[PDB]
């Protein structure tokens, strides 16, 4: 298996998979950031309510 | 949930504590006023006894 066409096709498939993974991980990073912000806001509200 | 329930419980407990403290202070003031009225009646009885001694 030594040819340039197979390498080009595999590179195209790898680029498509990389784009899909980039979208998938862009979703989870935003989800984690939203969860952390919500937790921080809830803790601040609890402290303010206690005071 | 602790923030929300803490705000709600702070409001409810402030209202209930104010009402209960007002009621307890009113009862204690009524008891103290009854005791003071009894003391004043005892002083008036002592004054009447002094008037009887003067008579």
Swiss-Prot record, chain A:
Sorted alphabetically, the keyword list is: ATP synthesis, Cell membrane, CF(0), Hydrogen ion transport, Ion transport, Membrane, Transmembrane, Transmembrane helix, Transport
**Compartment(s) where it occurs, according to its Swiss-Prot or TrEMBL record:** Cell membrane
Give the stretches traversing the membrane. 1-20
Domain of life the protein comes from: Bacteria
GO MF terms listed in the record are: proton-transporting ATP synthase activity, rotational mechanism
GO CC terms on record?
plasma membrane; proton-transporting ATP synthase complex
State whether it acts alone or in a complex, and with which partners, per the record: F-type ATPases have 2 components, F(1) - the catalytic core - and F(0) - the membrane proton channel. F(1) has five subunits: alpha(3), beta(3), gamma(1), delta(1), epsilon(1). F(0) has four main subunits: a(1), b(2) and c(10-14). The alpha and beta chains form an alternating ring which encloses part of the gamma chain. F(1) is attached to F(0) by a central stalk formed by the gamma and epsilon chains, while a peripheral stalk is formed by the delta and b chains.
**Functional note:** F(1)F(0) ATP synthase produces ATP from ADP in the presence of a proton or sodium gradient. F-type ATPases consist of two structural domains, F(1) containing the extramembraneous catalytic core and F(0) containing the membrane proton channel, linked together by a central stalk and a peripheral stalk. During catalysis, ATP synthesis in the catalytic domain of F(1) is coupled via a rotary mechanism of the central stalk subunits to proton translocation. Component of the F(0) channel, it forms part of the peripheral stalk, linking F(1) to F(0).
Family membership? Belongs to the ATPase B chain family.
What protein name is recorded for this chain?
A: ATP synthase subunit b
Task: Tell me the organism.
Answer: Chloroflexus aurantiacus (strain ATCC 29366 / DSM 635 / J-10-fl)
Q: Which gene encodes it?
A: atpF
Q: Which part of the entire protein is covered?
A: 5 to 55 of 164
